[model samples]
Each structure stands twice: as structure tokens, then as C-alpha cells.
Target: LPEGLDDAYPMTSLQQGMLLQSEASGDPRLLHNVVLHEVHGRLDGELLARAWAILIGRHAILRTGFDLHGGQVPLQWVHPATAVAAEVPVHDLCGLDGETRRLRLRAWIEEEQATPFDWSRPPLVRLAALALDERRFALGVAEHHSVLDGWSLQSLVDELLAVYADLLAGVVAREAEAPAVGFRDYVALEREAEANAASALFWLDYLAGARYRPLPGLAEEGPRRMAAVRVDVPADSLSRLRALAERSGLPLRSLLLAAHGRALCRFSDADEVVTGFVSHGRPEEPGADRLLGLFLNTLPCRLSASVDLLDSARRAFDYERASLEHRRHPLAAIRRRNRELRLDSLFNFVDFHPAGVRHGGILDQVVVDVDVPLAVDFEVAGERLEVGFQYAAGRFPAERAEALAGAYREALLALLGD
Candidate 1:
């Protein structure tokens, strides 16, 4: 209750369904790894606690809620009593081997999942011990997804580190407070935007009778679960990629998408490829950049193989661009278009914050950290399938995403080189 977020908004059908699923699963929890290194020397426990407090206070979503009542759309809200604690549990990883450490961590995380939390829960947040030695520590942050996303997790890590540094130096950290717009504001804006008759007409014209197409090699009659394999390239490879982009006169994103499209085409043997994508929705409006909430809208792409890789890349980029330009249009219009054209699966690129250099200087620890892999899990008639990719910065040795990306790059290069 950092001022005006006391009253809760009802949950939407989508939100309710998610909550119900989590509840039935005994609380669906997501765990992420945040590896923190000492800037100068070792980390001080007291300073770390202070940093954690500031991090939780600044971000309300850590304590937000999903309220389901009557016949109303579910809403998100911040409870007045929700707050972050200073004490974080630290685990010792020196004794246990790598495999043992992983098992222990996983078991600890499951226990955390079962831990109950209401409006009146002490230690609103908890940190579990990692198997890291004295010099390094493994921190476990478990939270409900109702209020957190991948971006938010990284944001918390940044804020925590910054605040911790300041606290260590005996100084107060100046935190810039976010604006007072809640998720409801976004919902209202979306609803109103979609209500426009003209935009509705445009969408109807663009997306009529869109068919939900599945990706290739996927089982036709079985539970759909997402499996991901990551690939990593050397630091020099990124420079090579930039050179390739410059030579082709294409944006890096275009190249990446074209490669993905080619791979899908080759694997599925399908002529037309449709994938879901995300739109930014913030085009030149005041405070638009700062406005948070699911500003993401999914658009379906219909890519045909009549064009080369470069042509395909350009077409995909343009198609995405046009959708964003008309994002304020009505959903009904898009639905109408879907009805008419029978569009395909959704393909989106969520380019929010870029990955940056983490470690630097004489420590010989210059590292790039990207977020972890991400995918959306959904079940069609009790058959679940995940569709997404997570590209993290090259800090750790997790090069699986890079390898897949490289394969895609080779595919595109083959098409372009021909």
C-alpha cells in the first residue's frame, strides 16, 4: 500500500484461469537464478538486507494480488500490508557437489512453493541458501507470477544491487518512483482502443478466419510441452553477426526472424508460416515509455516462401511494423479479419531492455548477462505445448540459445548467399 493502491481490482477471466491453475497445482511458482558478484570485495550481509528491503518497497508488483469476485473481470492490486524483509536465508554449497547442490536447491524451491502467503504474511519475501561458497552466494527468489514477469525480475536484481551498494557505503539510495497508473488503466485503454469502429474495420479486414496452426514435428494427438535447447557463440561471433547485418542492409532482428522462418519452413515443410509477435504500443505519446502493464498485443504473421531470406526478413519486419502502427484498433476488427483470412500462429519479439556488460576491470570478469529462456505454456483441451525463446546475455556458460541462433543464422546465410 505505497499510497493509493489499497482497493483491489477484480481479476479478468484470463487472470482467474491462471490463478485457478496455479491453485490447483498447489501454487505455481517460477524460480530464477540471480548470481551476484562482489564489486570491490566480499558482500556484507547487513548491506544486502537493506538492499533487499529497498528493492521490494520500490516495486509493488512483488506484493500485488489477484482478486476474483462475483461476475467481474479479475483485477490486480497491491495490498497495504505487503512488505519486504531484511533477513535473507543463506545456504552453504561448499560441502555438496554440483549435482547434490542442484538437487538440494530444487527441493528447497519446491518447499518454498508450498509456503503460504496472504495479505498478512511475515517476510513477505524469502531468500533460500545457494550452494555457493563464502566468496559467492546463491540466492533464491520465489514469487507468484500474477505480479512479476521476466523483465520485472531483472529490474529487481538491478535495483537490489544498486541499493545494496549505496547501503554498504552508508548512503541513502535515491529511488525514482514510478507513475500511479495501474494495470486497470492499461485494460481500460486497450478496451477503449479496441472499441473504435474504424480500427475494428481495419482488423476485420486484416485478420478474418485465422486458423490456429501448430508448429512442425509436434505430435498431433498428445500433451504439448515446450522443450528448448540453447546455443552460445563466442563474443567475436556477435561482431561477425553485426557485420553480416551491415552487409545485408538488414536490421539484426530481421535477420534473426528470417533465419527462424527458414528453419521452420525447412522443418515443417509448410509453404505458409504464421507466428505470434508482441507490439510496443508506445509510439510518441508523453509518458508512454514509462507506462507499464501488459502493453503487449499479439499479432499473427503469414510468411510465404515466394521471397528470399532478405525479402522474407524485410516482409516480416514490415508486417510487424504495420501492426504496431495500427495497434490502437479494435480487437473485433482483427477477429473479423481472422475469420476472413484464417491467419496462423503468433510470432513476436519482446525487445525491452538490452543486455549489458556485467563484470569489468582488472578482475578479468567482463561478462554479459541476458535473462533466462522464456516460453508460454498452454494446454489445448488438456494438451499442453510451449512456444517461445529466451536469449540471455553471455555471462554464464549457457550457450544453448546461441547454438540454436547460430543454426538459424546458417540457414539464413545459406538462403542469402545463394
Candidate 2:
């Protein structure tokens, strides 16, 4: 194990809900899947398993405790004698010919949802693997959201694969060092940073007179359901889009967000729109990059969409860039601003992460697939709406996300044509 592993924080309300739901419904795990793929070559199961054993030992969050301070307090992680395990589940999608076997190995990860650092039970880190006759296999890692976020996942995969490669070649794999800081340290840092006076002042000024305006294109009477859409353009298409943005002096993300704003303008008929964007809140502390923890922060972007598409795109870009530059302040600053303005339904959110890192090499070898189930089970009245766009690592299908992305692309193309 990497040395100096310490305690962690209790789970937040959202994480508790995720665990409870997964425990209650045996089918769909609230766990997010991070699958790694290799084409034209077979994976060494024994070597892969040993590599994971060393990997988990190096990361404390993979084996920690949990506790709750009081009513609805966030959950925490603690380090003790808990050992985590990994599982590998195998299947054959090739059907009856039986010449090839499709393999799926799963890693089970858990976090403390009720209390801080209990350390009584074993940590949930397990891998499941299946061998196939075909020259392909999938490595799926499933972990509770409390211990990791989007960026952390990428970092973990990078390290895991690096070690796995060494093991496969019969080399002595170097043990991954333990992280310097624990998950709770990050949470504490975030809380302290957001509550600072400077952050408060920023929020007080920006939200002085805001009002919540629903975005356009939303159904007026469909019980306010939350949905997700994603799109995956080929590497070449992305390159072309990047070229287009450079020629127009615009960022691709800004253009895409602007297109979404236009769709909202037509759907919800709101003049002003506000949406959330996710940022990697990595503080400028020494050894910050090497830590395993959650550092995602949300920023609110308000846009005036009454103008033409090009103007709107530029405005969105400016708004996004400014938010990112000043993202050190707490999100509460914006929330306070919006509260003063009495705005509700601050538009919808759009998140962008570089696709290549997540896809790894799976997109080049096989058809990627993803199935996002409905966020809600029973329909309810007067519930707030939320939407997400995920670009799964290469093993998953892209069609589901692509459809939504296509709609936005078509709408934007139409506007540009005009």
C-alpha cells in the first residue's frame, strides 16, 4: 500500500441516495462503469488481477470507513484494516458459434454513507473477469460516487493500465504510491474556499436581481421530467468542428452550448437562460494532482439568447470563459446571486470532457455503446428537472447520446444556414 493513508469524510445526501437505491433495486447499479479495451490481443487474467490488487492497496479510498455527524450530514471515509476486492464477469455476445468468448471484468467500489471512518467492514473493491475465444475483453470498474469524480476516474484508468501493461510483460510492476491527502481534506478545502468573504461578495453582486427563466424547447405540460442526451462525432468530424471554431474565432464548447441555448429558447420561450457547468477544482496546493478525491465544482452561466446564433455563441463563450477564470470562489456565490434575483430553473447544464481520454482505444476497435436509464422511477408532481450528457469510455455504445447531440447539431446547422 502507498504509505500514510488517513481517514475520509461521510457521504453526502446524494451519495446516500445512490447507495440506497442500488441496494434496494438489485438490477441497475448506481455504480458508473469505466471499461478498458484492447483489440487484436488477448488479456492476461492472472496478471491483470495481480495488478489491481496492487492498485487498490495504493489508494486508501478503495478501503475506508464512514459516519454521519447528525441529521442529513454528509458521509465520510476512514482507513483501517479493511481490504477491497475486484471481480471479473465474463460473457459471450457472439452467440452460438462459440469460437470466441467475450469477457467483462467488474471492480466493485463502496463508500461510507452514514458515518465518518467506521473501518469495521471490508472496503468494496472487487474485479470480475470473463475469458472469450475472440481477441477482445473488457475491464469494468464500478465505484461509489463519493470516492471519485470524472477526472479521478481518468487518472485511475491511466495508472491502472500502465501497471497492467508492465505485469503482462512479466516485469516487476512498481507499486503505485499512496495519495498524500484524503477525500475529507478536499471536502474541507472546498467548504472553506466557497465560504470566504471574497466568494460571498462575488455572489452578492452577480445575483442582485436575477429571475429564473426556463429554457426554450421544453415540454410545457409533461410533468417536468429530466432527460439526458449525448453525441459522439468521429475524430475527423471533431477536427473539422475545431477548425470551424478557429476560423470563426469561437470555441467549440461555446458553440455547442450556444446551440443548446437556442434549442431552449425555442422550447421554453425564456428570454434569459442559466445553466450549470462542471469544472475541475484542483487547488494549487503541492501534491494536489497525486491525491485521490472529488474536486468537481459547478458554475452557473447566464446568457441572453434573443440575438442571432453567432452573437449568442460568442456571448456564451465569454460567459463560460469568465466563469472558469473566476471559478475559485464557491458556487454558493452564484446561488446567493440567483436567490437575490429570485430566479428559478436556472436553465440546463452542459458539461464537456475531452472524449479521447475516456474512450481510450475501444472506439477504434469496436462499436461503443451506452444505455442511460430514466433518473426517476415513479412519476411525481412539482419536481425540479435535471439533465446529463455522458461520453462513456469506449466500451459503451454512443448511439443514445449521439441522438440528442444530432438534434442539437441539426438545429444549429439550420440557424447557421439562415
Candidate 3:
């Protein structure tokens, strides 16, 4: 162990799975999340860097690294804040022309995305500033997916904006404000709930004799290439779905999942479908929602396509409620019990609400790469729902992906009788 270790604890199941996959594929880029934004304001680079220093000091996960060979299961080591340095290198492009600056900024972002993080390093995050002019700058961040999820990313950004504002107003603190609940507490809770025989039995019974089915070309051998397609869901269709969810007393997510599951069945030509659904892994523990860490879990969702869409939604809702107690179990651990299981498709519903941050319009937001053959996402886009299909391009070409996406939209729309 290093001398300045603040704490050492077990990695979450998702983190463990990520480490295993990264090791198997030898590609750290798979775990990278890159973001770039253009800010038009009187931004002080020094103050921004200082704000990040305080932010990192507050979140233990920000200064964490994985010890792959140190223990039976890989552990995360949190180093003291002093061990990690906070610096944001600035690239001055003031003398360049408009197109030149645009091209240069794009190239810099590409370089940042191409660079991989070292897992052994305490802070697996990087930042840089590209000065477009005296008042405008392009801020780029590259961070490991294991460190933060979508919720945590928004929290970090909100805090950074506040901290920078305080620094500008001459507010100083001897120590940064810490969350009431740290990530270690969450890990301990997971460990305590690790041995739930009832949960195990529930899964065993729920997935009884369930065989995984793959969509056309989903199981074909090919290189791991990715391409994403976005579909704009009509407002009327969304309103109708919401109305149906309310009338049936089911959550909107359940209906969306049910629809997506049915679409998977149509594509795979199977009556029963088993896919993956993401759960916000925070329990009802105090302050769990406010913690900044990787608390997202992807669990297997098994549903039958032979039933009506509404019937499927009801069953999905019931199963989701029943499985809440076992969300801590890692998918990999569950797979250990069933060696024949395969996840070719995944569904994620993202709703990120950021408490006001002082930045210009979002110039670019990079999507995290997916390992599965096809991953679908429904995002809340300001009074509208936007659907995205990210699939393996090598096996499923653009034309095929477009067709698949159209089928998914049709499936969702059919639930509204559109």
C-alpha cells in the first residue's frame, strides 16, 4: 500500500465487471467518457482549476484508483487529496482564423479522446482548455466511466460552477464541503446485502429455462465498431404513452422497457426475450441520491413477447418492483450462475437535470462507447423524448441500424395506437 492512502475498499460489482472487460479487450478507451463545451464569458482559468481542486478534494471517488493485483477481488484505493495535482493546460489559439480555430479545437478533442487513462493513477480524469479568444474558450474533459455516471457528472459540473463563482466573489474555505454519505458507506451496505438467498431464488425462478436470443447478425463474429442513430419521438406519441402509463398506474420507464423488449423480440424472431436494463443502483439509504460515484447497475430483464404490449408492461413493472431488493448483485455474478446467458441488447433511460451551470450552449457531448452489440437510450430532451440506437457498425450497417430503429419507434408508437 502507498503511504498516503486515505481509504481502501472493495470495488462495486459494475466496476469489477468493467475492469475484467477492459483487461480482456486491452482497450481503456472503452471506459472513457469525453465532453467538450464552449464557454463565452470572462472565464478565469486559474479560478476554474482551483475550483476543480476543491471539488476533487470533496469527492473521494475523484481521487480513487484500482489495485488489480492487490487482493482477491480488485479494490479501489483512495489517495489523499495532496497526492493528486490539479492542473488544466491551456492552448492559446488567439492568432488563428475562425475555421483554423474550429479545426484545431476538433483536433485537440480527438487527441484527448485517443489518450487512455492509467488505472493505477489516483485520478483517472483529465482537463484542458483551448482559448478561442480572450473571452471564449473550449473546455474539454476526459474521464473514466467508472469514476462517475450521468447523474454524478451533472453534480460535479454544478458544484464546479458554484465553487468557481465563490472563488470569484472572494469566498475561501479552509476545507471543502463533503457529502454526508461517502462512497465507502455505499460499498459497505452492498457488502452487507451480498448474501440474500431470497433474492437469488427470485432470480432463479424468474429466469427458469430462459434461453438468451440474439438479433440478426448480433452474434456474428466481427470487429467492435460503433455507430449511433438518433430518432425524434413525436410529442403526441409521448403524451399518449404518458397517458397510458398513468391510466394503468405504471411508471413510464416500465412502458418504455416493455416496448423496447417487444421490439427486440420482433428483431430476433423469438417469443421470449432477455436483455439488459440499467438501474440507478442507489438504495433508499440516507443521502444516497446525493453521492457522486458510479452507482449505476445493469441487470438482466426477461420478458415474454407472446403477450400483449400492455400485459408485458404490467409484468415488467411487477418484475422491476420485485427485483429492487437485488439490484446490488452484479450482472457478472448472476451470469456466473448461468453460463449460457448472453446480453446482445441493452436499454437505458437517462434523465439528467443539472442545477444551473454558467456555461454557453453545449458545443459537443461525446457518447460513451458500448460493449454490447446494440444499446438503446431514451433521453428527456426538454419537453420531448429523443431515442438513440448505438450499435456495432461492423456487424450491423447503417441501413440495417436505421431499419431496426424504425421498427423500435413503430413498436413504441403502436402502444399509443399511432
Candidate 4:
């Protein structure tokens, strides 16, 4: 181990997967998670950088580096607070037209994504700023998915803005106490409880004889470029879907997930389908949410022919609840138990309203490459519902992805009519 090691612990299940996939693919970009947000307010880059440095010192995961060949088990070593570094660079983009600034910013983001992170380095996150004017700016952040999830990203940005505000006000941002439950403790707890026989039985039974099938028209070998096609659900359709979910007492996510699965089935000409999904795996322990780490687990969700759309939604909701206890079980472990399962597509649902004491605002997120062939997302931001299919363009055609989005919309509309 390097000098000034604060602590060492086992890698989380998802982290291990990320490491293995990176090694197997020989592409570090597979481990890269990049996002750019537009900010609209007065911001001090120097204070923002300081705020990030403060967060790095507070979050253990921020000071973490992985040792792949260290021992029998891969370990994540946390360096001392003084040994880590935070990279936040602010670029001045004054006197540029809106179109010119956006085009230039897009090129910069692509270059950043093309660059890869050294897994052994502490503080795998990086941020850059392009000031469009005195008030408007574009902020870009890149990090390994192994260290942070969507929820953690949003929370960190929120806290960063708050700290920056404090610094701007000449108030020394108080050093908050360490989280009650840190990332290391969560890993220990996961190790202890992850191998429950009940979970194993549930998954084995749940996925028994489920053969993995790639959707029609998928390329077996390709250049592996990622692209996305987006479609907005009509406002009326969204309202009706919400009403249907409320009337049926089902989560909107379950309904949307079922509709997505049905859309995939349409391409496969099958009555049943299985797709991957990510779950927020944070436990109910105190400060678990506040703590930063890879607390997201990607698992397969199965949907079969139902008596009706409500029945399908009910089944989806029931499966979600049933899998709660076993959600922590690693996807690798599940695949190992049954070697015949494969997931070519994933479905994700995001419901968030980023309205708050805004020193800056989030305009949009920069699109980045996806590892899977197709990943469908249904996002409800406040009152609007946005649907997007981020897919591997090399393996799946853009037209197919567009049609898949249309099919999902039709499925939702059909469910609403029912």
C-alpha cells in the first residue's frame, strides 16, 4: 500500500463489476461517468474549488483508490485527507455567442470523456467550468461510476453550492462532522448480510430457466459507439398515466417499467422479457444517504404476459417489493448461480425536482456514452416526463431505438386507455 493509508476495505459489488469490466474491455472510458450542467447565476470559481476540496477531505470515498492485485480480494484504500487532491478548473468564455459557446463546450466535454482515469488514483472525480458571462456558465463534472451514483452527484452539487454561498458571504463554512455510517461500514455490513440463503433462493427461483436473448437486429460485433434518441411523453398522456397509477395505487416507476418491458417484447415477438435496472442500494442506517460511495446495484427485472396493464403494473410493483431484501445481492453472484442469463438492455426511472435555494441552476446534463446496448430512461422532473433511450449505436441502429421509444409510448397510452 502507498504511504499514509487511512483505511482499506473490500470493494462494493458494483465497484468490483466496474473494475472487472474495465479490465476485460481494456477501455477505461467504460468506467467514466461524465455530466455537464448549465448554471445561471453569480459564481466564484475559486470558492467553488475550495468547497470541493473541503468535501474531498470529508468524504472517505473521495480519498479512495483501488488496488486490483493487492491480495485475494480487491481492496479500496483510503488515503489520508492531506494526501488527496481535487481538480476543479474554471475557464473564462466571455464575449462568445450562445451557439459558439455551446459548440466549443461540447468539444471540451468530448475531449475530457476521451481521457481516462487511473483507477489507482485518489479522488477519481474532476470538474471544469466555462463561464458564458458574468452570470451564466456551464459546469462539467466527470467521475468513475464506481465512486458515485445519481443521488450522490445531486446531493454533492447541492452541498457544494451551499458551501460556495457560505464562502462568498465571508462565512467560514463549518466543517461538518463525519457521517454516522461511512462507506467502509456499509461495505462490511453488505459482506455480512449479502450471502443470505433466502436471497439466493429467491433469485434462483425467480430466474430459473430464464434464457438470455438479445433483441432482434442486434449486431454481434461492432465498433461499440453509444448514442441516444429521446421522445417526450405528451403532457396529457403523462397526466393520464399519473392518474392511472394513483388510482391503481402503484408506483409510476412500476408502470413505466412494465411498459418498457412490453416495448422490448414487441421487438422480440415474445410474451415475456427481462431487462436490467439500477436500484439505490443505500441502507436505512443513519447518514447512509449522506455518505458517498457506489450504492447503486444493477439487477435484472423480469416482466411476463399479464391479464391486463394493471395486472402487469401490479406484478411489477410486487416484484420490486419482494426484491427489496435481496437487492443488495450482487448481479455477478446471481449470474454465477445461473450462467444462462444475459441482459442487453436496461431501464431506469428518475423522479426529481431540482428546485431549491439556488445559487445556480441545472439547465441540462451532457449526454455520455453508455456501456449497454440500450438503456431506457423515464424521467419525471416536476410536472414533465421525458423519455430517452441511450444505446450503443454500433450494436443497435438509431431507427430501432427511435421505434422502441415510440413503442414504449404506445404501451403507456394503451395502459392509460385500459
Candidate 5:
């Protein structure tokens, strides 16, 4: 056992899959990707790293390591303290025109995101800052999915930003103590919560008879490189979807998910449809707020052919409700119960609207959606909504994925169309 060997908890289903997939490919890089925000202003590299070190020390999960060689049951360990070191990656693009600089930055970020990390080592959070000019820079962050999800990634950045702001404003040492909590407890809670009979039966019933409907064009097998394509819904048409959501008396999420589900069903030309979705796993209790850990779990949504918009919307509500309730049941366990369900394609909705916060330009996150190996990770963000397919290049030809994105948009628009 290493020093400060905190209690080794059993892995969550998501964690287990990430671990297995990484080991199977003999490339841990596929399991890791960066969540970065472009810093559009001058930043103090030393201060930013200092803020990071403090946050890292405060959050035990930031100091995570897996006991990979410890026989059959692997465990996640969080040491008492860990330090973050090094300067942010600086790209001097002072002389280039706007378009040229933008293209260079995009290419650099793509290459940077493809690079993997040493998960067994602590401080899985990777940070880099690109100098766009004398007054602008970008802060890039990356980590193993086993550590933080989208929400937690934002949380880490928020805290980092908070600390950095305080240092710049000269906050006192007593007030500047790093804040961390809940990862170990969260893991323990997850283990205990998995014994829900009702939730287990929900899984069995919910997933029963659902066949994996694979899109013939996008077969997710082989040595893969992650590729992505994006599309923006016209403001008027997007508003049309919202209006329809109001008429159907369903939340926008349900409306959007239903349309997405229906599109996949049509795309596959099959009655059976199975799509994986990312869910927020924060416990519904006080003190769980802002807890830094990997609580995001993927749920397999089973949808068959359904043409009626309202009916499809209601049905999607049920799928989301059950998935949210039984989230404690690990994805691994869910998979064991329903082995036929395939997870090559995933859809995640991030309601990311940091509208009111006055965090200045320093903490604004740039869009850096990452795809896990051999999977098509689809996500729709915010109310105005941005949609994209973050996928493995091995699975989707660039042109095919582009067409698919258009088809998905058309499906949603079709519902809103007369």
C-alpha cells in the first residue's frame, strides 16, 4: 500500500468500462481527453498554476490513482495531497491574421486533445495556456473520464478561476484555503445504493427485448482516431422546436431527446433502437453540490420506431426518469443484465449557460468536445443550442458523419415543420 492509502472503493460502472477499454486497446490515450477554454486575456502562468496546485491539494479526487495490479478487483485511491506543476502551453500567434491564427489554434488543440495521459499517476487534470497575443491566451484542461465528467470539469475550472481571481485581487491566506469534498464518500454511497431491487427490476424491464440497432454506415470497430463535425440550428427553426415543446407540455430536454431518438430509429431503418446517454449522478441531497468526482453515468435508452411527436416525447420522458432514478446501478451491471444493447453511439445534453456569472474572460470555456474511442459522442448544449458529433475517425468517415448531423437536424425540423 502507498502512503496515505485512503480506503480503496470499488469502481463505478463507467470507470470500469473506461478501465477495460483502455487496457484492451493497450492505449490509455483513447480513454483521456482535455476540456479546455481559450483565455482571451493576459494571464499569470505562475499564479494560475499556484491556484491549480491549491485546488488539487484540496480535492482528493484530483490526486487519484488506480490500483490496477491489485489482482481481480481494482480500486480507486485518493491520497491526502497532490501538487500541480508546470507552465501552460504558450502559442505565440501575435503576427498572424485572425483566420490564420484561428486555424492554427484549432489544429494545435486537435493534436493536443488526441494525446493521452498516465491515469495511474495523480493530477489527471491537464492544463495549458496558449498565448494568442500580448494580451490574450487560452487555458486548456484534460483528464481521464474516470475522474471528471462535463459538469465536474466545469466545476474544477470555476474553482480554479475563483482562486485565480482572488489571488489577483490579493485575497488573504485565511480566506484562500482550497475547498474539496465527497469523492470517497460518493463512491461508498454508490456501492451501497446499487442494491436497489426496484431500480434493478426497472433496468430488466426497461431494457428487456431491446436490440442493438447499429447504423450500417458507421461501424465502430478497429484502430480509431477521434474526429468531429458540427452543425448550428437556425435560430427560427430552433425556436420552433421550443414552441413545439411547449405545446407537447414536455421540457426541452425531453423534446430534443425524443427527436434525436426518433432520428436514430429512422436512420437505422429498424424498429429497435438503443442509444447511450450521459447522466448527471450527483446525489439528490444537501452537501452534494459542487462535489468533485466522477458521478456521471451513461444510461442505455431503448427506443423503438415511433412517428408521433408527442408520444415519442412522453416515452423519452419515461426513459430519462428511470435512468435518473436507477443511475446508481453501474453501467457494467446494466450491461450484464442487457448484453444485447450496444453503446457505440452516445448522446449527452449539457445545459451549459453561465450567463449571469461575472467571471470575466478568463474562465470562459472554448468548445472542446472529445469523443471516446470507437464511439459517436453526440451532445447538444445550451438553450440557443449547439449540436455536434464527436466521434472516432475509424468509425465515421468525415462526410458520412456530416450527412448524419444534417439528417438529425432534419428529423427535428420535420417535427416542427407543417
Candidate 6:
């Protein structure tokens, strides 16, 4: 809607789904994710602001927002340049003690996160930096999920560090590497992928007559309050899982997927379990590496209740590989095709290996981990090798969720040969 702007690409299937749900429900927080970071060592406020502005201007999605009115198809709008705020947000933690500082940051995060984004406004993204001292500070990135997926978030971090390094090292415009392919080409590629016949049929066959199996110990799903519990698979166990992967010729993730269904079978009566997968919708293309945007797709995956663990693992690999060809097919279309198909509970394994990425001198920056309108019966996230469950507090009691998380670790451990 401004100079240097381009006519927006149609919202991808997953993007449309997020937009429609939030717009209809008038709950923008459903589309939010706050990325918190602790900035330590010789903090540079002026340069940091410049780096963020550069990060936003370099990418289209970072400055993009939705237009749902006028009976239009609801397109995304991208701005050319967004300036850094002249004044940065700071809660002087310099005088406060360590524990008190921690508490203040926590309260600030919870309250600020509760505030929804005004998408019609120019900058859908915002930054909050706390002045920890002359040398340290904390930075929080609050942005919408529909604009970018998890991996893209990582890309943003990488770029922030890279840009900061450039400025610190005195790099100039002409000498700098040519600009990376932004999300424009990606927008075109997506529309092409949507027309793929193979992906469509894959979904039709995979989800022919699937049904939602509400996990036991869950009540009605109305206005659910999410409850969370976490379990860590020891680094030693993670190593054991590694060898188990080699022996079975299954990826660790595939093994983990099978383990989830095996753990769920005891609670549900289904022989073959259907669960939604959080997919990285990036296709195997050259230009996609540097671009940032919402390229995630959620699809239903079924793991057969096989007695042989390795067999289930293999099946898990096979189905996941095949599903990639059609992962972008929208959930809305799938529901129309099979009304019985339901994602009562979902599984997401996010072994991002944050140990390396979390605070790894990342532009000397550090992680914030949200009222997720729990959209499913339950959802699980595997941070590194450990797993965490987020479910309706009332519907799925904490103890039961804890039991499931515990059983999952046990099942994974049991899979390895002694």
C-alpha cells in the first residue's frame, strides 16, 4: 500500500486458515508467538535497532499484513521500509537484583504478550529491549505466526547476527553480497505447488475416512485452558536413540513418531492412530534457502498399531516421506473431502537442538517460550530430545498428560536393543 510495494500473492492454504480463524473469532493472539532473547555482553542499543530495521526491510513477510475486507480474496500487503523506533522500550533492571530482575521481566512478558497485534498498522512486529546494565540487556520479538513459521524464525536470528557482524566489521553496500531472493518468487512457487495433482490425491487416500479420537481424561473442548508438562529424554538416552535409528534404518524423528502412536494406543481403542503433523512446507528448491515466511503445513498422519516397533518405525518413515509431496494441501479442503477426519489431538516434535542455537553467541543474544487457543484435543512439542504436552487444563488433567509424556520416554527407551 506504499512505494516500492508489490501486488500481494494469494495467501497460502495454511496462511489463509490462520487468518480466517483469527479474523472470524476476533482473537489475534491465536496468531501470535513471542520469541524472547537475553542479550548479554557489551550491549549496543543503537546498532541493535538498526539491525532489526534492516532485518524487516530486507524481507517482505516481516512487513506483511492481511486485508480481509471488500469481499476480496484476502491478500497480504508488504511494505518497503520500516524505521526502527527512535526510543527503545526499557525497564531499567540495572539496579534490581538478579531474582527481582527475572520476576519483573516475567511479569512484563506475560502482560505484553496478552496484548494483540493491530495488523492494519504498518509494523506487525515489535521489539522490547530491557536495559539490564551498561553491558547486558534482554530482547523480546513479538510477531504473528501466520507471517512466518518456526524455521523462518531461525533465519531471522541468523540474519540478525549476520547483519550485526557486518555493521560491526564495517561492510558497505556495493561490496556486500547480492540481495537474497525475497519471498516474492516464493509466493509464485506456492501457487504452482497448489495445483499439483499428486499432493491432492495423497491426502485423499491417506485421510479417506479418518476420525478424531479424543484422548482419554478429556472433557468438553469449549473455551479450553491449556495445561503444560515437560519430560527430558536424557542426552545419554538420546544417544541410545541414535543407535536405535541406525539399526532400524529409521530416522530418529520417524522412530519418535511411532513411539507416540504406541504410547497413545493404550489410551485410545484405535488400531491405526491419526495425528496432525507440524510440517515445514518448504519444498526442495534452490531459491528457498534464504527467504523467510509462513511455509508450514499441518496434515493428518496415521501410524499403524503394529506389534513390531521397527515395522511401525518404517511405516512412519514411508508415510512421512510420501506426505511431503502434498503437505501443503489445506485442512479446509481435506475436511470437505472427509468430514469424519478430525485432529482431536496433534503431535509436533521440535528437536531444534536449541542447546547450540539457544544462546550460542547468537549476535550475543538468547529464548521466550504462550494463551494458545488450544486448537486441538492436545498438542505435544519435543524441544531437543525432551517432550512437552500442552492440553486443555480441565479436559486433559496434568497428571494424565504427565503420564503420557512419561510413557513416551519409556517407549522410546524400550525400543533400543540392550
- For TM-score, the strongest prediction is 4
Q: Write the per-residue lDDT of candidate 2 for residues 35-109, one digit (tens) a residue.
A: 435323356666776767666667666666444334356455555433455434544443334332322222211
Greater TM-score among 5 and 6 belongs to: 6
- Candidate 2 vs candidate 4: the TM-score winner is 4
Rank by TM-score (best first)? 4, 3, 6, 5, 1, 2
Which pairs clash (backbone N, Cα, C closer than 3 Å) in model 4?
A: none
lDDT tens digits, residue span 1-418, model 1 = 2355555554433334445655555533322122323233344666677677666555445445555543356556665434434566665656778787667655665566556655234333455435355454555665544334435544565566567666756788877646566555555666666666666665655554444455433333432122344333232443454567798777666655665676556544677666545454433544444433334554555666544677887886777576665675533346544554432233444344412212121111111111122231111111211123442222212344344446454564554453
TM-score of 3: 0.92
lDDT of 2 at 85: 56
Candidate 3, which ten residues in sequence have the lowest lDDT sum?
353-362
Question: Which of the two candidates, 1 or 4, achieves a greater lDDT against the reference?
Answer: 4
lDDT of 6 by residue, 121-158 (tens): 55667777777777666776667777767667777766
Instruction: State candidate 5's TM-score.
Output: 0.84
lDDT of 4 by residue, 1-418 (tens): 6667999989987788887877787765675777777766666888778888888888888888888878889999999878887668888888988788878877777778778888788788888877888877777888877888887888777677777667877898876565577888778766755677788778899898676777877888789687778765755767888888888899889888888877778767777888887787677776676777778777778888654877888888998999988888888888888888788888888875644225355534545555677778888866778888787789888778777878877787777774
Give a tens-digit lDDT track for model 5, residues 150-231.
6777777877777776675678322332234467666766776577777778888987766665575775564556665666
Give me the displacement of residue 209 in model 5, in angstroms: 2.0
Model 5 steric clash pairs: 34-142, 39-137, 39-138
- What residue runs in model 1 are displaced by over 4 Å at the alpha carbon? 1-17, 20-46, 81-87, 94-99, 110-131, 177-185, 209-213, 221-226, 231-237, 240-249, 281-294, 328-410, 415-418
Candidate 2 vs 5: which has more TM-score: 5
Top-lDDT structure, candidate number? 4
The residue ranges of model 2 lying beyond 4 angstroms of the native Cα positions read 1-5, 9-44, 69-75, 80-82, 85-126, 175-185, 213-237, 247-250, 285-291, 325-407, 411-418
In angstroms, give how far residue 197 of model 5 lies from its true place. Answer: 3.4
Query: Distance (Å) between predicted and true CA of 372, model 3?
Result: 1.0
Worst 10 residues of 4 by lDDT: 354-363
Model 4 stretches with alpha carbons more than 4 Å out: 174-178, 354-366
Please estimate how well model 3 matches the true structure, expressed as its whole-model Cα lDDT.
0.77
Stretches > 4 Å off in candidate 6: 1-4, 82-88, 165-181, 351-384
What's the CA error at residue 346 for candidate 4, in Å?
Answer: 1.1
